[PDB]
Structure formats: C-alpha cells, structure tokens
Design an enzyme around this catalytic site. Sequence first.
Site, PDB file in Angstrom:
ATOM      1  N   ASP A 158       0.745  -0.891   0.190  1.00  0.00           N
ATOM      2  CA  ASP A 158      -0.163   0.071  -0.200  1.00  0.00           C
ATOM      3  C   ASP A 158       1.036   1.067   0.078  1.00  0.00           C
ATOM      4  O   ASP A 158       2.216   0.986  -0.398  1.00  0.00           O
ATOM      5  CB  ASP A 158      -0.687   0.016   0.642  1.00  0.00           C
ATOM      6  CG  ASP A 158      -2.157  -0.362   0.595  1.00  0.00           C
ATOM      7  OD1 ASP A 158      -2.241  -1.007  -0.064  1.00  0.00           O
ATOM      8  OD2 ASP A 158      -2.942  -1.168   2.088  1.00  0.00           O
ATOM      9  N   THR A 189      -6.035   2.374   0.309  1.00  0.00           N
ATOM     10  CA  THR A 189      -4.504   2.657   0.794  1.00  0.00           C
ATOM     11  C   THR A 189      -3.546   3.248  -0.707  1.00  0.00           C
ATOM     12  O   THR A 189      -3.707   4.695  -0.583  1.00  0.00           O
ATOM     13  CB  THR A 189      -3.571   2.170   1.901  1.00  0.00           C
ATOM     14  OG1 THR A 189      -4.856   1.271   2.862  1.00  0.00           O
ATOM     15  CG2 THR A 189      -2.552   2.911   2.094  1.00  0.00           C
ATOM     16  N   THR A 190      -3.428   2.116  -0.708  1.00  0.00           N
ATOM     17  CA  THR A 190      -2.195   2.650  -2.362  1.00  0.00           C
ATOM     18  C   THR A 190      -3.145   3.770  -2.824  1.00  0.00           C
ATOM     19  O   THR A 190      -2.034   4.552  -4.117  1.00  0.00           O
ATOM     20  CB  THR A 190      -1.459   1.945  -2.275  1.00  0.00           C
ATOM     21  OG1 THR A 190      -0.343   2.527  -3.662  1.00  0.00           O
ATOM     22  CG2 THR A 190      -2.436   1.402  -3.685  1.00  0.00           C
ATOM     23  N   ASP A 237      -6.212  -5.612   6.084  1.00  0.00           N
ATOM     24  CA  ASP A 237      -7.520  -4.965   5.229  1.00  0.00           C
ATOM     25  C   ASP A 237      -8.945  -5.616   5.642  1.00  0.00           C
ATOM     26  O   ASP A 237      -9.569  -4.507   4.917  1.00  0.00           O
ATOM     27  CB  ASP A 237      -6.787  -4.399   4.371  1.00  0.00           C
ATOM     28  CG  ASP A 237      -5.681  -3.526   4.689  1.00  0.00           C
ATOM     29  OD1 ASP A 237      -6.041  -3.434   6.315  1.00  0.00           O
ATOM     30  OD2 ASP A 237      -4.111  -2.828   4.214  1.00  0.00           O
TER      31      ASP A 237
END
Lengths: 513, 517
Positions: free
Chosen positions: B49, B82-83, B380
């Site tokens: 991420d 996220t990333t 996650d």
Amino acid sequence: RDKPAQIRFSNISAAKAVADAIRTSLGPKGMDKMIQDGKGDVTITNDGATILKQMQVLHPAARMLVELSKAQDIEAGDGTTSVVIIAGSLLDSCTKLLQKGIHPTIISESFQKALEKGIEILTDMSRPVELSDRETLLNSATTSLNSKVVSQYSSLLSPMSVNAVMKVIDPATATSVDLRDIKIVKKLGGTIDDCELVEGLVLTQKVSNSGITRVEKAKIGLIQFCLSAPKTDMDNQIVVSDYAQMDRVLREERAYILNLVKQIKKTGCNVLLIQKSILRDALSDLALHFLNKMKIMVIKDIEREDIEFICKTIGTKPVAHIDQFTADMLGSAELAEEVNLNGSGKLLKITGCASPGKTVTIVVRGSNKLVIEEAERSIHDALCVIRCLVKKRALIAGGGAPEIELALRLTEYSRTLSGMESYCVRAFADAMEVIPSTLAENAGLNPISTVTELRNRHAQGEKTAGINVRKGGISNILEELVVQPLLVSVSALTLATETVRSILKIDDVVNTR
Amino acid sequence: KSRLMGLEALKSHIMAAKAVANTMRTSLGPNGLDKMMVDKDGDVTVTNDGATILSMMDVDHQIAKLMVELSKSQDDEIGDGTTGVVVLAGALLEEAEQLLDRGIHPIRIADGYEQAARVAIEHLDKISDSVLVDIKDTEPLIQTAKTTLGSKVVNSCHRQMAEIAVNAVLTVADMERRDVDFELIKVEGKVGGRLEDTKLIKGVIVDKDFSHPQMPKKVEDAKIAILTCPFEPPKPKTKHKLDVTSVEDYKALQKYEKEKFEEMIQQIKETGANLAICQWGFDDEANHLLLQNNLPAVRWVGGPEIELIAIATGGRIVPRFSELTAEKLGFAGLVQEISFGTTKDKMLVIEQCKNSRAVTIFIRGGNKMIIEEAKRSLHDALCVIRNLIRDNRVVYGGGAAEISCALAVSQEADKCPTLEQYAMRAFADALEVIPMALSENSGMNPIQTMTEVRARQVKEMNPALGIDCLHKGTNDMKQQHVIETLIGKKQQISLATQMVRMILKIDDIRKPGESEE
C-alpha cells in the site's frame, strides 16, 4: 536513435518557440518591434500579419509557419495570425501526449476527426449571410474594412469590394471570386477616391509618353514581332566605319519604321503589347516613338500581368509582323485609354473586350503607393472576405472568439469520443480557448487578472457567447462587428492541421546532402 | 533562513509526490508490482500500500510527511484503497502545479476540486450496490478475501481466512449493531503452524501453561478465571530461591505447594473456572505439582494478558487471592485447550461469547514473513467489512469508477464553468490515472486499455464491469468481481484533494532556518 526524439521536440520546439513569441496579435498590445537582423540590419516591425510574411526563421518547422502564414492569406486574407498562433496549439497537444507516449500517428489521427469535428462546430455556430447580397457583402467587408487600412475610403471601396463581385460572382451560389477574378491593378496618381471600380479587363501598363490613343476602337495588340527595319529586324546595307555611315544606319532605321507603325495602326490598333522578350532589342525604341504617334499603346518588355489577362480575359493572341499585317487575333478592344489622374500614371482601359463573366478590374489609385495600398490592402481582403463568403458562406466571429465556443462544445465530443485520439482530441479541443488570452499577451505588469477571464467568461457565455476580442466585452461574438467568414478559420484549422501533423511524421535523420 | 516562493516551494513540493506516488503506480493492485524495503540496519523486506512502505520508508518532506499522515485514516477504517490516493492525490498534485503552470490560483484549483469530488461522490453514489447483507456480504467478502487472500501472502484465496475474515468482524459488528471497530477485531499470527492453520478467534488465545502435560491436560468449564492472584502459590515471573536450610524443610515445601494448590484449587474453583490465569510466574516444579494435583495451572502470564483478557471479558481480575469473586475471574464463552500447531505446545483458547471487548482472530505460518504477509491480507480485509457493515455499500472499482467518476466530473466541467471547470477537468483526469496506472503496472498499454472502458463509458454507464484488475483476458469488474466498499472508494475520495488542500494551507512557506529540521 534519440535524434527522432530530440529533433521532433526541436521540430515542435523551434516551430512553437518562434510561433509563441509571435502572439502579440489583435490590438495595441506589447510594444513596437524594431528588428535588426543576425546580419545587423535595422527593420522596424509591427502588426504581425506583415511580420508573419516578414518572418525570417531558422529551423524548418519554423519555416513551416511562414508558409502557414501565407497559407491563410489566399485561403482567406483574414486570421493569418490565427493559423499562426494556433499552430503552437496543435504543437502543444503533440508533446504532452507524446510525453504521454501516445503514438504520434494516433495524435496525427487525432487531427482529422477533430478537424472533422472542429470545423463543423464552427459551421454549427456559423452565422449565415450571402455571397451576392450587397449588404452581407458589405457588413463582413465592413468590419473587414473597419479595422483595415481605409474606412472613409472603404465607404467607396466596400461597395466596390461588393460591386466588383456581382460581376465576378457567378449566378447565385457558385464557386467563384478568386484573386484572378477581381483584377487588382495599381494606378499611379489620383487618390483612393480616384480608386474606382473599372470594369472588365483593364490592363495597367507603361505606355511611352502621349500623343497616344485615348481614342475608341483599339485593336488591342499582342505582338511577338519586330518591325523589320534597318537596325530593328531587317538587314542594314550600311556598315559603319564612318560618321557619314554611322549617321546613315539610324536614318534608314527611323525613316523606314514610320511606315510599319501606321500599318501597325492600320489593323485598327490602339494597342500592340510588345513581346516581353527581345528578338534583338526586340522593338527599337526609335520605332516605339512612332508606334505611339499613330496612337498605339506600347509597353516594351511588357509586364507579365497584361500578357495573361489580355490572353485570358480579352483572349488576345500574337499577330504576324505588320509586314505580313496581322491575323486579326488581336483581342476584342473598343478602347485604349491612357489616363493621367493627378496627371500621373499611364494606363490601358479595355472595355468592349471578351470577359468570362469574371475579371472585374479595380484600378487602385493614389498620389503614392501609400494611398494606393491604403485602398488596396483594405479592398483586397474586403474582396477576399466576400470571396470567403462566396467560397464558404455564413460567418464566424473575428479573432478566434468562436473557437472557444468550439472548445466547450468540441471537448465533449472529444470526451465522448473516448478513443485513443479522444484524449488527444480532448487535449487539443482545449488548446483553442487560449487564443484570445494569448493575443492579450505582451503589454504589461501587475498582469495576470484577465487571462482565464479572457477564457472563463466565454465558457460562462454558455456555449453561445464570450468576450469580443476585436470590440471588447462579452456578447454573442459571431456577429458583433467582430466577424470573419466561416471559411476563414475552418481553413486555419486545416492549414495548421497537417503542418503540425507533418511534425509527428518526422523520424530518423534528414538533411539532404 | 532561506525561503522558497509559493509556486517555487510547490514546485519544490511537487518534486515529492511524483516518485512516492510512482512507487504505487507499478504497485497498484496485483498487476501492480508490490513494494520492497531495505534497512540501514540490514533488513530487506517487501512492503505494501502506502502505509506499510511509506511508514517503513521514511518521509523527508512535508508532502512525503503528510503522506503517512494522510494515509493513516484510510487504512485504519477501510484498509483497502490505501495505495490509491497516493497516486491519486499525487496525480491531482501534478494537476495543481499544472494549472498554476496554466496560471490558475493554487487557491482556486483546490476549490473546484472539492465539490468535484462530490460530482464524483454522487457519481460514486450511484455505482454498483449501496447494499449488502449477512448471507450476501459473505460472498463479496469471499470475493474481497478472494482478492485479499489471493493477492498477498498466497495468490490462492484460502476460504478459511476468507470466512475467518467475515465472521469475527460480524461478531464485533453484530455486537455493535452494524458497527464494528478494527481495534476489537484483531489479526494474530503465530508461526510454527501454517498459513493453512488459520483461526477465527472471537476471544483470547494463549498457550496453556503446562509445567507438565501428563499431569492431566484439560480445559474446564467454558469459563476463564483471570487472576492477579495465585491459582497456586504466586511469583512475578522472576527468580524465586527454592532452597531449604535443613534436610527437613525439603519435606514440607512440596506439601505447602500442594496445600495451597488444593486451597487455591479450592478457593479459585469456589470462585469459579478451575482454569485460572495467574498473572504470576511460578516454578515449573510446583506448577506441575498442582498439575499433579489437578487443573492445568496458567503461570508466567503477561501482565497485560490478565487485564487484556479481563477487559475483553468485561470482567475484572482478582487482585488478591483472599478476595474471591467470579467477576474478578474472567469470562470465557469457551475456554478450550487447543494444540498450537503440530510443532509445539497446546494453547488455551479462551473464546469469549460472554463478552468480547477484543476479538483477536488467529492464523499460523510456515514462515514469519508469509504469516505477516497473510495478516496483511487479514487486517484490511477485516477493515473493509469494518466500514462495509457500517454501511453495506460497494462499488466495482479498479478503474471502472475511475474511468467513470471522471465522466461526471469532467463533463461537469463545462457545466461548471470559470475556474471550476478546470478544477473539474484537472480533477477528474486524476481518476483515470489509476486504470491507466493499473494498465501501466500490468503488461498493458493503459491509454489503449483506458480507451476500452471509455468506449464502454460511452456505450454503458458506471460499469459493474470494467477492466481486468487481475489482468484477465476478460475485462469487467464483475467478471473480475472487483468491487470496493462504496464507503472506501469515497472514503478514498475524501483523501486526495484534502492533501492538495493541505499543501496550500497558509501563506507561510518561510522557514526560520527550521523547516524539516
């Protein structure tokens, strides 16, 4: 090699680079340019149209634009800065998408469908007017005589800009009105109110002195022959070692020719247009003395313009030496008229000549070429404007203001194209609205307030409205007295289109040696 | 005490997001090549991420600094996406200087981006299903843990964790009324088992203390006794001298050991839960002399554990062995002695259906890398459902919304105009960066690949289908079943312009001579 990389930028670069500093256009912007060349020679430059033609450019894709500059002139006569300024705009879309790694052929493909989309939306926003309707011919030319050289004189020229056409215009809608159609000839002397529409084929020419024919029923000449005389076309029996022999050869010359000059007249000739070249000297000037004394107009080494029009509009052919008389292939002439107004200039007015249904002549007069060109440059575009209305009807606003209407409308179709080109088609659909902002460009400090205001407010003109770049302020730009024929800019698109596309076609390494 | 000017600083700021978002751009999704870390201390590792890498990577610059800062809230709640904003906010970042390069206020650009998210928000709002339910969301979390357990540790979704992902979050979710806390659900690996040893743990798991197995191994009641007090004579995990001054005291000790064993066997049992977690360490000798008596005796306990399992139970701890009540004992929904791995000791799994104020789901691994690679999946995947129960809303992701949410916004541009259309335009484009960038990190030509669902976007609208995220020959987000919490995408949406909105904050780019110092 990285050369095709480095050069295609260098291509785009020095193309766009020169072209970018080339935007001062449309109004008293920046400050005057006095050019002193790489050889150190003073020029004082201004009003980029000429500058576009003045333009002296190293690098080829910069030289591409001088061409492209002239490309708009005969296509329109209007918005030559336009096709020049927007040249960078395509060049813009190249690199950014070349950076994007979009294959430049896709970007090259991106130009046409755009050019297919783009000129259409201009026609979609176009404002219909006519080619033969003197008012629509007036107004477009009026605004194109409003900011052009003469206006007070255009009040004479605007109708002649119109009046020349109704001759030239072929019935109703017709592909018509070329520069070969309206015959534009300077006349020394007079003024612009002496500039007048002089109908048919009127040959501006240098006729020796006077005592000439101003009299009706010319046989308008085209003559490739010498009067065959001592020291003209015929052998001299007298060799000169002597002043009695040297005075003898001119006397036998001048005493002989006097017969042919009348015989030259005996065809009915009030004109013989001499061959442009020399058979020896061709026609002796001692001959040309007596040719005009018989009232026959002579321009020796005749200019190119008369030869064609007289072979074209009048349809005149060469004729036999008047020792053989003539073939009566002298074109239709009922007059050779040499008028001196201001007392200046020598002329050939041919009325009663063959004419295509075109070749109206305008005889552009002035105490100097200034007054002449004053009328000339104004009336010419006013013709070319009307010419555009002829060649393509309706209208668009002056100064690329409608291109912003296109930018809004087009980008959608660019968007909704959703193709590889659509991106490019979107990228360049957005490269238009710059042009009014970028003409504002060079003048000042505390600067930047209006740039996007030169944009946004148009974009907030809906798709129908924006600031008038000629007159100022937002209206519906297309007819504000900010106007050019629809034809004008749709060419600027096309003209700049493949030029920049040719830049995408530059690969490997080329210098011919 | 030198001072960058505005755009300059931002031009200096724009120098940041480029590479750090770039790292994502070939790391995006499974077609993205994930991230590696090495250490000045000599540890080469793989990262993921933004947060993992960008925390493990260290951030020089306020831009880079805010990354981890901007990053946290994302992976906290949703855990997935996220990333994304890294690329995205970095893209918009590079859209910002651009419009400044286009001569447009840093002020104004950040302005029309905000509600440009809205026309993407309302756009996202429409996308896919704003609904899921228990038997339903089982399957997308199957799908979610398909792509979660198939993209990270193993590329094989192992349905255990895929179901372990669904159940315990629900367990805290159904406890909290379609609310759940990522704190409460917890992902616990312990190696020596397998990545195929994977455990759904709604209670605490601890190795059952045997100072002897043969002295009976057993788990008793369903309930746990959490003790700061002794269940057998106590000792604080520290050395206690066992000597006897005479040969006779040798005789009385083991009796004393057993007298308090049975007494603490007595007094903790009468308190309750013969299994009793004694915070205190104790000799392996007498600990198994109580084992010899009875009742495997939990000793050498982590001081946190007792109170950890205490609060989880909601029950208290016995501070003092003379004080005895079952509330000061713990609450196990089930105490269960459970062999930990085939390799080593039985544990005592306390699974709390009594109260779980913490739920630590469990897994093992053949390696600590892969087991944490797995937890990386688990956290996650437990994070999406976390919000994804709080709103069951899901939107087919992977560029299908990016190719789409850009549709509303970039079309909203000339709907907007003045500066907002730009801040609609240079906004929405940042969306289609990722399907481009996902086609980028794939073997795929992105503009080409982007052009495809584009045609679809002209053909269809808001595709539940889309482009292959898995780099499948077929392009959906349906056939790909690539769909993210319609929270998380918008949750992700919330992040990107915020950063650009952050970089502008005040007029002060000056530094005392202290900026990053």
